[PDB]
Amino acid sequence: GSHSMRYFYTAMSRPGRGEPRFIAVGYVDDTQFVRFDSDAASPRMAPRAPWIEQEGPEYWDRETQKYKRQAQTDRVSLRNLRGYYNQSEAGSHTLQRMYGCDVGPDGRLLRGHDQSAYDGKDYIALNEDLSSWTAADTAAQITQRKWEAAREAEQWRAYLEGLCVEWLRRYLENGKETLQRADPPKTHVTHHPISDHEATLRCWALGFYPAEITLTWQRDGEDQTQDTELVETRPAGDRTFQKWAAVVVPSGEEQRYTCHVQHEGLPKPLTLRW
Ligand code: NA
Ligand code: NA
């Protein structure tokens, strides 16, 4: 029922080679819908989902200019940051930002987000109040003061409560056939002896969307929390996801074990066995 829009910006300096590279990607839930890359050839902003290709040239040009303005801003930021940390003019550095809005099933704002990081560590974050900042270190207190003076949080609040939510609603409607349809997992259980007295049971989930999923193993109905091995959820490359969970069991006791699969695309969870 609930949904999110999120942007992910990365700016990477390369002093003496060129201006910093700026790349942005945007998502609705777990679906990417846009990329901008200052280093790409032609064109620099590309659509990544079909429902976005429905938008017209005014929309595209508007977004393009926002990306171009941000790339310039990020160049100033990276310069300022090397000063803040008394760094050499020679090393490469990375500035990241992640922002967006979460809405409930009624399309109403649940909460907004904006966060930045420098060289992979938290730098400054908008608090959930959309009115104040958390500086992660002493240097980020510089930005905090500058942004307080500029009433930067007020601009964020206006965006997060307004256009962020409005546009997310629009994308969800235009993209409803995919964005609002959960694809349940395709499942199976496999068996792999590790010796003649123990064997691995592996419970698979393939082809599911969104990425959130819960795979568990039980022995006679008791959860095997501490003895289940999970791989990280991984992308299939076609917008769907994959995961597996494994337990190692005494040979000949396989019948005691059940795999349980919970996913938004499954009205009732699945129970699977070897
Ligand atoms: Na707004
Ligand atoms: Na299945």
199, 249, 260 from 255: Cα distances, Å: 12, 10, 14
Question: Which-ligand-closest: CA of 162?
Answer: 1
State the burial class of residue 146 (Cβ atoms within 10 Å of its Cβ: 0-12, 13-18, 19+): exposed
CA of 4 to the centre of ligand 2 (A): 27
Distance of CA 112 to the CA centre of its chain: 14
Centre of ligand 2 to C-alpha 130, Å, is: 42
**Residue 245 · residue 229 · CB < 8 Å:** yes
d(CA 42, CA 13): 22
Q: For residue 35, what are the domain limits?
A: 1-181
**From ligand 1's centre to the CA of 167, what distance in Å?**
10
Are residue 154 and residue 186 in the same domain, yes or no? Answer: no
CB atoms within 10 A of CB 268: 6
> Using CA atoms, how far apart are residues 25 and 7, in angstroms rounded to an integer?
6
Task: Give the Cα separation of 79 and 95 in Å (integer).
Answer: 11
d(CA 195, CA 243): 25
CA dihedral 203, 206, 210, 212 (to 10 degrees): 20
Do residues 75 and 11 make contact, with C-beta atoms less than 8 angstroms apart? yes
160 and 118 in a single domain? The answer is yes
Whether residues 170 and 109 fall in one domain:
yes
Question: What is the number of domains present in the chain?
Answer: 2
Residues 104 and 161 in one domain: yes
For residue 168, give the 3-state DSSP assignment.
helix
Distance (Å) of CA 171 to CA 31, 64, 178, 254: 11, 18, 11, 47
Ligand 1 centre to CA of 266 (Å) is 36
Are 170 and 228 within one domain?
no
Ligand nearest the Cα of residue 268 is 2
Give the separation between CA 122 and CA 114, rounded to whole angstroms. 12
Query: H or E segment at 97?
Result: strand 94-103
Resolution in A: 1.6
